[PDB]
Coordinates of C-alpha atoms and ligand atoms in Angstrom, one line a residue:
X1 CA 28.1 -6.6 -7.7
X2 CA 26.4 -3.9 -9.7
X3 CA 23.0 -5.6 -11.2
X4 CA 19.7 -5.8 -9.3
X5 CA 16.8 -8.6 -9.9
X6 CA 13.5 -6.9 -9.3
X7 CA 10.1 -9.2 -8.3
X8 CA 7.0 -8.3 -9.9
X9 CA 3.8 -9.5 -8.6
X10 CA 1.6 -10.8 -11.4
X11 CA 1.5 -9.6 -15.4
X12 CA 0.4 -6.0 -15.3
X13 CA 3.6 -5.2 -13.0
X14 CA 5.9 -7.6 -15.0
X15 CA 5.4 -5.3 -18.1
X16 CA 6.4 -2.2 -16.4
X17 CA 9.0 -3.7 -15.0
X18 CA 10.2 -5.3 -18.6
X19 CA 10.3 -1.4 -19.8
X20 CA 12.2 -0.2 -16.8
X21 CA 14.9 -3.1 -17.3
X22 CA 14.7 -2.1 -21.2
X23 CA 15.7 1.7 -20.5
X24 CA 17.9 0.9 -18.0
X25 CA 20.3 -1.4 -20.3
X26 CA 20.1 -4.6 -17.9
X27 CA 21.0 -2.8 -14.8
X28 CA 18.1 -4.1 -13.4
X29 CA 15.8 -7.7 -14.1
X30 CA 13.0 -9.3 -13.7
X31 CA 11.4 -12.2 -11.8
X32 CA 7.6 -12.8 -11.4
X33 CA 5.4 -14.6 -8.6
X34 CA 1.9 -14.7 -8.5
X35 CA 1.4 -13.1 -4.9
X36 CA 3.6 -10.9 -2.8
X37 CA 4.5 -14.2 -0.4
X38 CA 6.1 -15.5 -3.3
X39 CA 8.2 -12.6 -4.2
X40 CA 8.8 -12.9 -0.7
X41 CA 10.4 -16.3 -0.7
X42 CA 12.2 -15.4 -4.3
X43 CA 13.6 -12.9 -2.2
X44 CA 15.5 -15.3 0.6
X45 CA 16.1 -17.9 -2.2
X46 CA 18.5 -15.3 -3.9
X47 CA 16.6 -15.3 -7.4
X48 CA 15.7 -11.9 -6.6
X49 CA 16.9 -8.9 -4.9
X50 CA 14.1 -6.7 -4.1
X51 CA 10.2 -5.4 -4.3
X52 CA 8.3 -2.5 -2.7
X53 CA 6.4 -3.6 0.1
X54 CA 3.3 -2.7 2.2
X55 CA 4.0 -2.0 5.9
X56 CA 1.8 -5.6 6.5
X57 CA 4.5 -7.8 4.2
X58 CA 7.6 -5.6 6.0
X59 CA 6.1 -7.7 8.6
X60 CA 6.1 -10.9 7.1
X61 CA 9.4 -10.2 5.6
X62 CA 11.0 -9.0 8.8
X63 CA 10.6 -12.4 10.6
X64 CA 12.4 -13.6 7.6
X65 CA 15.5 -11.4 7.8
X66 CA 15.2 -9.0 5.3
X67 CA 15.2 -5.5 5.6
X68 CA 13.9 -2.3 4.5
X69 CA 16.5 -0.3 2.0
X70 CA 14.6 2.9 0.9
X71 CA 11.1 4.3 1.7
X72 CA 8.0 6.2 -0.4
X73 CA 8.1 10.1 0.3
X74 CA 5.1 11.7 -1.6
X75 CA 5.0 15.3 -1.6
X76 CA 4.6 16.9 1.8
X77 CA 3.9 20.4 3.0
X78 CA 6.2 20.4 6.2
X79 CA 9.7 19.9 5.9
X80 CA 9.9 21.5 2.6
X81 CA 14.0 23.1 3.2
X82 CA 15.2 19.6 2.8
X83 CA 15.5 17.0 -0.3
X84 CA 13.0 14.4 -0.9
X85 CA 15.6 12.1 -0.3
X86 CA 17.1 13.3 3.0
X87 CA 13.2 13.9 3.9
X88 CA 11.8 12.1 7.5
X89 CA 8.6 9.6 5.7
X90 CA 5.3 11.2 7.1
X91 CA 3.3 8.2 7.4
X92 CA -0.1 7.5 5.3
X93 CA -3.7 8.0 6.7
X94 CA -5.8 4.1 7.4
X95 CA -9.4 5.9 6.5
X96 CA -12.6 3.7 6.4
X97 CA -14.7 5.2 3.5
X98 CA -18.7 5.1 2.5
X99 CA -21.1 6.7 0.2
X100 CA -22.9 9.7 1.6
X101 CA -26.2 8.3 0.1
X102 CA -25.6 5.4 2.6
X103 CA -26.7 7.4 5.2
X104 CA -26.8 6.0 8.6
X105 CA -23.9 3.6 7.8
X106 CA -21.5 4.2 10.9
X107 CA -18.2 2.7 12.6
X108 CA -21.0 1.3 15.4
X109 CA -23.1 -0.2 12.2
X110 CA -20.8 -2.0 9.8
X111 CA -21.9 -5.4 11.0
X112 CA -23.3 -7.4 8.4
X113 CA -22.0 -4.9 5.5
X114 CA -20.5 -5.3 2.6
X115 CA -16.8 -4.7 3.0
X116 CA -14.1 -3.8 0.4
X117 CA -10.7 -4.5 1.4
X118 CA -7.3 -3.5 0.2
X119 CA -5.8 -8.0 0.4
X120 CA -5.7 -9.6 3.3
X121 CA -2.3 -8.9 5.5
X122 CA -2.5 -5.0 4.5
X123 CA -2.1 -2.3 6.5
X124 CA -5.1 -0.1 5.6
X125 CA -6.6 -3.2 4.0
X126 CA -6.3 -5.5 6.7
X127 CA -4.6 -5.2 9.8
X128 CA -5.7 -1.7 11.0
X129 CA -9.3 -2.2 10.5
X130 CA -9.5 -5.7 11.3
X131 CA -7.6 -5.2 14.5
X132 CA -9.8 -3.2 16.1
X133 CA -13.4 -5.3 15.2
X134 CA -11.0 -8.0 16.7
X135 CA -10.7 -5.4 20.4
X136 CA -14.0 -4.1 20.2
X137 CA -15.6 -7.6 19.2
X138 CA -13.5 -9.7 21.3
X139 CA -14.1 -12.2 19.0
X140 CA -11.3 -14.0 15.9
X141 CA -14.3 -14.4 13.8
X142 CA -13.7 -11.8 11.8
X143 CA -14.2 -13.8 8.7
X144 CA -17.9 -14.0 10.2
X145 CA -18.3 -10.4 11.1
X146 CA -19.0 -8.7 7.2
X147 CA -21.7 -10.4 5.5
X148 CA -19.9 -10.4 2.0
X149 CA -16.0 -9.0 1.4
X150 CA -13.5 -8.7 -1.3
X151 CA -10.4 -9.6 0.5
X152 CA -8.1 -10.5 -2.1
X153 CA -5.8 -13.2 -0.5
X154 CA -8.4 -15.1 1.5
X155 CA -9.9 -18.7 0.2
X156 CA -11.9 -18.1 -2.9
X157 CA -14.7 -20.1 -1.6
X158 CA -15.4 -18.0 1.7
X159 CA -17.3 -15.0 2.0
X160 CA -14.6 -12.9 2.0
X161 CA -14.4 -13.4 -1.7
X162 CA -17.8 -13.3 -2.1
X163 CA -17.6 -9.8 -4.1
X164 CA -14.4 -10.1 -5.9
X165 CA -14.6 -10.3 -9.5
X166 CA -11.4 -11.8 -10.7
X167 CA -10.0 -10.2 -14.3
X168 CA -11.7 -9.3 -17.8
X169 CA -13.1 -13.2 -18.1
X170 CA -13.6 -13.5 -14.5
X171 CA -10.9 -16.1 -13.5
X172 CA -8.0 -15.4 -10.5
X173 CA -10.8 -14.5 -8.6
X174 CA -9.6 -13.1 -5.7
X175 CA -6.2 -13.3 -6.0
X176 CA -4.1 -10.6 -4.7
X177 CA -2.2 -8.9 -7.2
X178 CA -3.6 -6.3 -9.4
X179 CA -5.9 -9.7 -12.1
X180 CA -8.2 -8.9 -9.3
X181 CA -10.6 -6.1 -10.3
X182 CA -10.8 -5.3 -6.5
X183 CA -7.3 -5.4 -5.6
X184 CA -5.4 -2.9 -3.8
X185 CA -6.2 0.9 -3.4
X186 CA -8.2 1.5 -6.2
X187 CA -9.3 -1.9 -6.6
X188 CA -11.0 -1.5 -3.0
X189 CA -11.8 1.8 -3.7
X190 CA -13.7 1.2 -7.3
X191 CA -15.4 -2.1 -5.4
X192 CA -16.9 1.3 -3.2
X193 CA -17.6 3.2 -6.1
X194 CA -19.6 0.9 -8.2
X195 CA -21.4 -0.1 -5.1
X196 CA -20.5 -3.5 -4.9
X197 CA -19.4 -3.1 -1.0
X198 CA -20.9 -1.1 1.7
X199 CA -17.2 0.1 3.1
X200 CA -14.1 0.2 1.5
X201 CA -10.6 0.3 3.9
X202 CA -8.0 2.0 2.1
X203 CA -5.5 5.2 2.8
X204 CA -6.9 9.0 2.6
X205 CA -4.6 9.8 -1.0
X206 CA -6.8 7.2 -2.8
X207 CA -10.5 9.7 -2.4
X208 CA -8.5 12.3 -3.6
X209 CA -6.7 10.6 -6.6
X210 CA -9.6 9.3 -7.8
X211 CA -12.0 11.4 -7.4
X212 CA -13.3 14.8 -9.4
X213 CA -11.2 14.2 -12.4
X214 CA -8.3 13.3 -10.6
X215 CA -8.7 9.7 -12.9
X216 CA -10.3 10.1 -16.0
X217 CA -10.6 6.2 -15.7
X218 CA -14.1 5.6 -17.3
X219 CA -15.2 4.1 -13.3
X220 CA -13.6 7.4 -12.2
X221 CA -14.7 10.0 -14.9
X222 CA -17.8 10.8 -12.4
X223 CA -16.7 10.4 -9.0
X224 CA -17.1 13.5 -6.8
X225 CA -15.6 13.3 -3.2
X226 CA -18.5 15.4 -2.2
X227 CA -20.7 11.9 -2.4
X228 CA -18.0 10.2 -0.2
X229 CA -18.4 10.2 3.9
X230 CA -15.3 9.2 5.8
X231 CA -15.9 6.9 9.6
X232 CA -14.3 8.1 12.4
X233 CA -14.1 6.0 15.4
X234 CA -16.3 7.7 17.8
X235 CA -19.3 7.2 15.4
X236 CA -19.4 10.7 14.0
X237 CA -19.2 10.5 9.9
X238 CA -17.1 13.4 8.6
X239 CA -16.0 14.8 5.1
X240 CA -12.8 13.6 2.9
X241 CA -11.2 17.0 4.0
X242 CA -11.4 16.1 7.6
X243 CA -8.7 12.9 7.3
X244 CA -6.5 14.3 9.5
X245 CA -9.6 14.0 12.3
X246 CA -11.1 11.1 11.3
X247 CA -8.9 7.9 10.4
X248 CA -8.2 4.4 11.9
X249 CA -4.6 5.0 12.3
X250 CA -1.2 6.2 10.5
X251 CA 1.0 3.9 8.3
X252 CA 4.3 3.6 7.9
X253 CA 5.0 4.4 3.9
X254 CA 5.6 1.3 1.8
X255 CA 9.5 0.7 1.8
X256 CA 12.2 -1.5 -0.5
X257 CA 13.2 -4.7 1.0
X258 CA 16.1 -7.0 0.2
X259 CA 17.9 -9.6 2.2
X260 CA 20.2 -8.1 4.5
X261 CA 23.3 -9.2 2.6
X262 CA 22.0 -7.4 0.0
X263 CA 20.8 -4.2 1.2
X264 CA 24.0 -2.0 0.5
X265 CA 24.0 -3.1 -3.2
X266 CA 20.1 -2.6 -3.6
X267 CA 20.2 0.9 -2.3
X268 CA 23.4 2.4 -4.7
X269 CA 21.5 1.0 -7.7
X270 CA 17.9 2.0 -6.5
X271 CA 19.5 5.6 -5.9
X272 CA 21.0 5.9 -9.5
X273 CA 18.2 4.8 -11.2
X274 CA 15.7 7.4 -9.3
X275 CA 17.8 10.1 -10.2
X276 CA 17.1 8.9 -14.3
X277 CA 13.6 8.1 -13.5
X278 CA 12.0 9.6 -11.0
X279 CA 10.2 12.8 -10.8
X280 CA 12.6 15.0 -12.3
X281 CA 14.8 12.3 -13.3
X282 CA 16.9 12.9 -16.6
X283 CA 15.0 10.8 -18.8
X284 CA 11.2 10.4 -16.7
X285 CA 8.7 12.5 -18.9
X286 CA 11.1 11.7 -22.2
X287 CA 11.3 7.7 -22.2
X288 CA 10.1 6.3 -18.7
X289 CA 9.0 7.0 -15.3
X290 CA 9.2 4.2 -12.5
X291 CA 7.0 6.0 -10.4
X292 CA 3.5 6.3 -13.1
X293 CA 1.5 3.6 -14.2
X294 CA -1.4 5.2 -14.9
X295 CA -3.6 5.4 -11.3
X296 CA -2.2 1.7 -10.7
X297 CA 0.0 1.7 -8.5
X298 CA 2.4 -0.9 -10.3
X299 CA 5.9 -1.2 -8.6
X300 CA 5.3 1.6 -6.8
X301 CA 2.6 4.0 -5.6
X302 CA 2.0 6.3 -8.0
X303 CA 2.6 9.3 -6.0
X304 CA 6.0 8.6 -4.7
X305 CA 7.8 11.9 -4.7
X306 CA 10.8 10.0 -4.1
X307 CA 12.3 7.1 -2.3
X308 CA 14.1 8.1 0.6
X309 CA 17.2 6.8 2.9
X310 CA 16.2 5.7 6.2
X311 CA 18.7 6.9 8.8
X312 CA 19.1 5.5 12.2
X313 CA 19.6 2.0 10.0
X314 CA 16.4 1.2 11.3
X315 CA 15.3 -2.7 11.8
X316 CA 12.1 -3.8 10.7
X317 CA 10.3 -3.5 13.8
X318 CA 11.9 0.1 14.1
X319 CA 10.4 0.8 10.9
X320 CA 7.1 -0.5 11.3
X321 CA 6.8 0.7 14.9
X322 CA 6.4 -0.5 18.3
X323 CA 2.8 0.8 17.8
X324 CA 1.3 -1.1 14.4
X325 CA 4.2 -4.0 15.4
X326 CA 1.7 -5.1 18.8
X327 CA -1.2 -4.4 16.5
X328 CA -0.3 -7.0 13.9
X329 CA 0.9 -9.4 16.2
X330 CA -2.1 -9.4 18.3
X331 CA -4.1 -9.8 15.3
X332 CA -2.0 -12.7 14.4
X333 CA -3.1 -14.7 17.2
X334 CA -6.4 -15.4 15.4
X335 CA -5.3 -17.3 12.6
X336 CA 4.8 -18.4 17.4
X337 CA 8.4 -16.7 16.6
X338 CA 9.3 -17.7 13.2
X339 CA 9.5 -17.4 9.3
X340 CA 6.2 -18.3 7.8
X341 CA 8.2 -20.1 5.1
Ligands
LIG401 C1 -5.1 13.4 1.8 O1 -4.5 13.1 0.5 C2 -4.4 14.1 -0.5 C3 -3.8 13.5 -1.7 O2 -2.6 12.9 -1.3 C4 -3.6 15.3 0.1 O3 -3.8 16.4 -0.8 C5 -2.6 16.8 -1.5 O4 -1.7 17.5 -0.6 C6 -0.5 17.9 -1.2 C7 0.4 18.4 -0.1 O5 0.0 17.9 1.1 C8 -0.9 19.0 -2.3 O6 0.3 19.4 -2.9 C9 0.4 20.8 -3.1 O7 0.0 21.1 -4.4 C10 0.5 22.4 -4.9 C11 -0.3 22.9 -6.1 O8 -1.5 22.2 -6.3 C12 2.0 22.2 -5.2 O9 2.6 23.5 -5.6 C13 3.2 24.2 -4.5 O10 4.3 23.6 -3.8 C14 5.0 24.5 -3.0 C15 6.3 23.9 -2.5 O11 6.1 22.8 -1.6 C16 4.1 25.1 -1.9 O12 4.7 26.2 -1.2 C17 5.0 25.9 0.2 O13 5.7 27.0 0.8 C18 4.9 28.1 1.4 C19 5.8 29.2 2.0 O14 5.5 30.5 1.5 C20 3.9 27.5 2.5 O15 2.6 28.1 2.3 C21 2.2 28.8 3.4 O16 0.9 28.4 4.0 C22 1.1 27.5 5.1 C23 -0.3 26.9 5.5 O17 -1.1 27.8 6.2 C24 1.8 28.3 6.2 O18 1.7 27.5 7.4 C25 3.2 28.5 5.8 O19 3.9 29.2 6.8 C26 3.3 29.1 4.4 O20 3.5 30.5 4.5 C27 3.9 26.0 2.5 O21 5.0 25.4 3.2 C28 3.9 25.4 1.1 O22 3.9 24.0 1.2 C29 3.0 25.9 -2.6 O23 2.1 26.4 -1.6 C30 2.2 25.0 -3.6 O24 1.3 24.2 -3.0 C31 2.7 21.6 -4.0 O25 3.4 20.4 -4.5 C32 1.8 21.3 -2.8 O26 2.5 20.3 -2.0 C33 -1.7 18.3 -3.3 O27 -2.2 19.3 -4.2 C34 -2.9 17.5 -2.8 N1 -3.5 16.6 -3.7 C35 -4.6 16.8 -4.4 C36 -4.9 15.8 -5.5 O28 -5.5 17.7 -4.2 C37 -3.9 15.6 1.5 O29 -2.9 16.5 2.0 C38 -4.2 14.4 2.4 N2 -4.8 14.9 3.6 C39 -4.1 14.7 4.8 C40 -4.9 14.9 6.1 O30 -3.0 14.2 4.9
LIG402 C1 -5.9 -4.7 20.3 O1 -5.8 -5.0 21.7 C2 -4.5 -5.1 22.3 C3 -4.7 -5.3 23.8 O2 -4.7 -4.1 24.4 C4 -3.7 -3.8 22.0 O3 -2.4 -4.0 22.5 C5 -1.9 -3.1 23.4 O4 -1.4 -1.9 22.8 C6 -1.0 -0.9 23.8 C7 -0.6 0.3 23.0 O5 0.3 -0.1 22.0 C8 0.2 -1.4 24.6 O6 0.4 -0.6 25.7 C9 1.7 -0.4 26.3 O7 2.0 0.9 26.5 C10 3.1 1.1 27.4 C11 3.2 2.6 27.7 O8 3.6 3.2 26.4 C12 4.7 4.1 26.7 O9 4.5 5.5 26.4 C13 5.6 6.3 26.9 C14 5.2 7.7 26.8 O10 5.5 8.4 28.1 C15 6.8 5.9 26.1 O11 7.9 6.7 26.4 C16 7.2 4.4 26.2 O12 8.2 4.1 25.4 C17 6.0 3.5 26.0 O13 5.7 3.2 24.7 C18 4.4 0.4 27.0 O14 5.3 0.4 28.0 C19 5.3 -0.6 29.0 O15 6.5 -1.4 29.1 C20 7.4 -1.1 30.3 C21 8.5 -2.2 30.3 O16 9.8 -1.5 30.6 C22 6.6 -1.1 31.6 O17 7.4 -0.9 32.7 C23 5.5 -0.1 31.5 O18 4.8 -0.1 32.7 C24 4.6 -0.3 30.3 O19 3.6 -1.3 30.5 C25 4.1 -1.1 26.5 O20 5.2 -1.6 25.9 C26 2.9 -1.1 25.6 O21 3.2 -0.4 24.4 C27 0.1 -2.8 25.0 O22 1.4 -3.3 25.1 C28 -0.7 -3.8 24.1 N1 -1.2 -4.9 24.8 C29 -0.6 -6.1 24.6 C30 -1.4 -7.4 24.9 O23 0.6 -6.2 24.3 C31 -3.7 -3.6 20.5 O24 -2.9 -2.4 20.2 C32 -5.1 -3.4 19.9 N2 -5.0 -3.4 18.4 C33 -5.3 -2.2 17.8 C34 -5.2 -2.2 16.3 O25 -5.7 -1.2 18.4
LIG403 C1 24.2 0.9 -15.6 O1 25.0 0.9 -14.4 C2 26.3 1.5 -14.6 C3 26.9 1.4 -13.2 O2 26.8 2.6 -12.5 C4 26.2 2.9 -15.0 O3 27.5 3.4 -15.4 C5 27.9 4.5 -14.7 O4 27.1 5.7 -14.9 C6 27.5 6.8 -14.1 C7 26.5 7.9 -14.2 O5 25.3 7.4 -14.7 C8 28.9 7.3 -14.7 O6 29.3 8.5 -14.1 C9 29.9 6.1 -14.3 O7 31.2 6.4 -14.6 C10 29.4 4.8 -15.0 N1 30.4 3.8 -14.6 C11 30.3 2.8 -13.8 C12 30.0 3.1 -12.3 O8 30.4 1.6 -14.2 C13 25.1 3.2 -16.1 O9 24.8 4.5 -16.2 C14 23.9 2.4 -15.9 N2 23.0 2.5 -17.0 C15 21.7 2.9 -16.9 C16 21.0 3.3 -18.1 O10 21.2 3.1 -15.8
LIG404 O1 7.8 5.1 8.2 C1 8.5 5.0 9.4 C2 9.4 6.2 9.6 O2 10.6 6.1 8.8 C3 9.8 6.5 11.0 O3 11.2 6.4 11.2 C4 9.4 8.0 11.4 O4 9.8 8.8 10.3 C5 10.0 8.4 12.7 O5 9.6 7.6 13.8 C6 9.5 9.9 13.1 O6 9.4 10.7 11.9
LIG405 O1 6.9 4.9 12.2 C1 7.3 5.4 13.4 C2 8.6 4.7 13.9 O2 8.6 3.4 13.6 C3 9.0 5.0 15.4 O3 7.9 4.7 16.3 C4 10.3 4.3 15.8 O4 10.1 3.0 16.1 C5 11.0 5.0 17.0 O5 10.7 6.4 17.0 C6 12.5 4.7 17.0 O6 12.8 3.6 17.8
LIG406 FE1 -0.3 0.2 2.3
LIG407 ZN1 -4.2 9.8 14.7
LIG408 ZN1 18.0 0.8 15.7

């Protein structure tokens, strides 16, 4: 079967993915969509055979019968005997983060702030923070519960919007694929740094990658983690060090999907082409690496050690978890068994 169709979401991600089907002599192509739905859909249609996706779109996805392939690995301490690709996934840290200058600004005072979010129907964007104003506020008007948000995703004219700022001549305001200024890790991230939010809801590698010189992005160049306060959920305000303390939850990594059919196919070629262009793949540093993108995060995160084999051929929900999989579906009975499409 032998040749895999690859879904990039939005422009920026359909160049690197142009260069990786360019070095790879047609083994794999590309389709684009505007939003990760739509790659979604591309995916069941057949016209593609795969994207990387958040634990929130797994989700999404799963109802739709496809199923995660491969998953991120990024460097870890523990379990250092075995290969990358062998390697049990660890998990990624939900952390709510703030300026220390904001003082006062706690878990028990972020009503009426100014939050930065991820997109809407992200894990450390979205889901795990939102699900819990939802429990503790017992309230689904959690559109109403930030004054002002960038949630990439939600209706351009709502509040949620209100402090996106859409590409260089401001248009795709809002939408949720890496146009948006405020899209994504660093997109919520920078949206903190430049104190445009109050909050930003992202995962604990994003402080440190972009922070003391870890970017040399020119919104980056001067960030010192020092002036960043992470919120714990018994009110306390801790430093960045202290993740492992002080988060909202643990993610499951971002994993490859495909359509079930599929999967086997997916995985050979996804394999082979990692062991070329991954981290010490025979021709990464010399011609291309799948896995930079310059602080991105385009196709993949940018500090994927590896993608990994699953074993135990999990099922989505095994994936995801019984845990985050009550969490999600709770919170989805705000906005019922079926595809969304
Ligand atoms: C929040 O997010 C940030 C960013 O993602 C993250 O910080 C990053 O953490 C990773 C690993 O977790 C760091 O990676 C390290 O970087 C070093 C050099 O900078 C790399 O080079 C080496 O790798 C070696 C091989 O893995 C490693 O040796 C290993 O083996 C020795 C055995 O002798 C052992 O060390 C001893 O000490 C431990 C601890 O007390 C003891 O228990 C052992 O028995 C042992 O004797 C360890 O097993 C060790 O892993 C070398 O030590 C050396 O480090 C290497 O790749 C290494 O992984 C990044 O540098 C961090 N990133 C940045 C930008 O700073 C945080 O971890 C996240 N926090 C949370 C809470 O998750
Ligand atoms: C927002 O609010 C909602 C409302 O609470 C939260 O949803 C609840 O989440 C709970 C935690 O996920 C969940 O609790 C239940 O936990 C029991 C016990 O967990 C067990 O732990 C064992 C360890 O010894 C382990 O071995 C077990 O496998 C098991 O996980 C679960 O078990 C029940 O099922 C049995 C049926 O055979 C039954 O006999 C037994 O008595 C238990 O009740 C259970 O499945 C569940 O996980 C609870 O289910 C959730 N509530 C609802 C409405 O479903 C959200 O998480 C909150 N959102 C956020 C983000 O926090
Ligand atoms: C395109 O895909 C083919 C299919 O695997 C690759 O050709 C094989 O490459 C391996 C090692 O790379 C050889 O050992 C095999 O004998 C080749 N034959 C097959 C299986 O057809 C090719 O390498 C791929 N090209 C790139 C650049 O990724
Ligand atoms: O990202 C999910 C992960 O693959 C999961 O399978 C865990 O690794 C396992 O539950 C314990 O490590
Ligand atoms: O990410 C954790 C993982 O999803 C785990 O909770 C599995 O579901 C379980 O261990 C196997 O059934
Ligand atoms: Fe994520
Ligand atoms: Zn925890
Ligand atoms: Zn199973």
């Amino acid at each position: 079967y032998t040749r895999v169709v690859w879904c990039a979401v939005g422009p920026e991600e359909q160049k690197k993915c142009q260069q990786w089907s360019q070095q790879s002599g047609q083994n794999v192509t590309c389709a684009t969509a505007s939003t990760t739905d739509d790659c979604i859909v591309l995916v069941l249609k057949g016209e593609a055979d795969a994207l990387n996706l958040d634990g929130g779109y797994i989700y999404t996805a799963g109802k739709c019968g496809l199923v995660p392939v491969l998953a991120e690995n990024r460097k870890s301490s523990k379990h250092s005997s075995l290969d990358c690709v062998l390697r049990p996934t660890e998990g990624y840290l939900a952390v709510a983060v703030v300026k220390k200058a904001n003082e006062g600004l706690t878990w028990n005072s972020l009503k009426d702030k100014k939050s930065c979010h991820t997109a809407v129907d992200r894990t450390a964007g979205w889901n795990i923070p939102m699900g819990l104003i939802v429990n503790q506020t017992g309230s689904c008007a959690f559109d109403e519960f930030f004054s002002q948000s960038c949630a990439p995703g939600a209706d351009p004219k709502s509040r949620l919007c209100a402090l996106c700022a859409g590409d260089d001549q401001g248009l795709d305001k809002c939408v949720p694929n890496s146009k948006e200024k405020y899209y994504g890790y660093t997109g919520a991230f920078r949206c903190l740094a430049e104190d445009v939010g109050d909050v930003a809801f992202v995962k604990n590698d994003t402080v440190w990658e972009n922070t003391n010189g870890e970017s040399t992005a020119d919104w980056a160049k001067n960030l010192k983690r020092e002036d960043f306060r992470l919120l714990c959920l018994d009110g306390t305000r801790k430093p960045v060090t202290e993740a492992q303390s002080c988060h909202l939850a643990v993610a499951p990594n971002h994993a490859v999907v495909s359509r079930s059919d599929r999967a086997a196919h997916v995985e050979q070629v996804l394999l082979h082409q990692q062991a070329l262009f991954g981290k010490n793949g025979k021709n990464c540093p010399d011609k291309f690496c799948l896995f930079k993108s310059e602080t991105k995060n385009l196709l993949f995160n940018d500090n994927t050690e590896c993608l990994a084999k699953l074993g135990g051929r999990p099922t989505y929900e095994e994936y995801l978890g019984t845990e985050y999989v009550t969490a999600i579906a709770n919170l989805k009975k705000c906005s019922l068994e079926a595809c969304a499409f």
